[PDB]
């Protein structure tokens, strides 16, 4: 990366906001995944959208790759600079604007995390529900198409993103649904917002997201329920969904995951396949939901439900399951699967995944959003054991292909990044791949928008 180019970057954002130091680049060369990569050639912190546009235009016209960087909590290598280039850390743009409580909407810049937003919203009676376990950038969550434990009731990022401000690869500024617009539905033209949700930084740089807010629940009840088997817990889940109980959260942990969370969070749940449950409503609706849900879990051998402060500990332990799993083997890294299947096929593939983890030498914990037909196998890898990393990636791809055989998808929320590009080709086929690539090419003709990811 030439000195003239670095000085041009500094002329846009200011000398303090450009770094070519090795340690700073290495800190921005990875996410929470096991993926490695060479670091970016520079890290740049634009201070406003005009600067984002000018940095993008400078890189694009000079043939320098651009890697958008939020909070670096992704798990598929999205920020790994496989082709070098400029890592654009967007988190100094950290303002909440256009809070429209009467319309249930708000606009956030990339430095705003969900934590920050919901702190800003207490006493409003509103909240933002999509809850990845990590303290992630909300714009990064829009970029990855994130979901979380609340999605079964309150939707994913795709359901809750109403508008996006995007700096396109050559610097142009796009408001996907129109500048300042927010509304419940539209048929006006082609929906551009949905194209950029889940684009992972390969189609442009999200510099603000317009989010749907939700009313806080009247009352909340959380519980855990222990089961004799994985089959029993997942059958209960499928039957709760088929009975149309509007559960707020329904999270599965196998016995391995439960034990790991116990050890990492000082929970003391019985070590067993377990559902973490949460219910929202009035006292009347809560009592109705509880007895219909307890009736189903009892059918499948579930324990009597183990009912402010304790639920916060419950869901904090769940949100930290990724780290609880890593703590089972200190020094290891992790790779998560993320298949999502038609719900009636979820018992088969979870039970099969449990059996396959047992029959293998790998350490795996099972957790996730089974209300969506989605789950994670968190597989531990020794960073220096090349045999084990080979066997983990083979395990992940076999699981992904089993989900595709069942009519499902290889990723419910994490994205493709570096890890699932072959699975994506199988999932959507040659015409799906070419169509996605044609969309990538019209927005990023020179292929400099986070190269090597997704496609
Ligand atoms: C403990 C833990 C729990 C997690 N739980 C969940 C979960 O329940 N659900 C879930 O969906 N994910 C989960 N994640 C994954 C991760 O938090 C999400 O994928 C999150 O959306 C990533 O946001 P980020 O800003 O940290 O991403 P980064 O790692 O910074 O970037 C991710 C990708 O998006 C791109 N990108 C980032 N910001 C922008 C932007 N502003 N514009 C354009 N492209 C951008 C990057 O180029 C990259 O390709 C978890 C991660 C951890 C560590
Ligand atoms: Mn998840």
Curated annotation (Swiss-Prot):
One GO cellular component term of this record is: mitochondrial inner membrane
Q: Which cofactor does it need?
A: FAD
Q: Name one Pfam family in it.
A: FAD_binding_4
User: Signal peptide: which range, if any?
Assistant: none
Q: Which SUPFAM superfamilies match?
A: FAD-binding/transporter-associated domain-like, FAD-linked oxidases, C-terminal domain
Catalytic reactions on record: (R)-lactate + 2 Fe(III)-[cytochrome c] = 2 Fe(II)-[cytochrome c] + pyruvate + 2 H(+)
Annotated keywords: Acetylation, FAD, Flavoprotein, Mitochondrion, Oxidoreductase, Transit peptide
Task: Please give the tissue specificity annotation from the record for this chain.
Answer: Readily detected in liver and kidney, with a weaker signal observed in heart, skeletal muscle, stomach, brain, and lung.
Q: Where is the FAD-binding PCMH-type domain?
A: 36-216
Identify this protein by name. Probable D-lactate dehydrogenase, mitochondrial
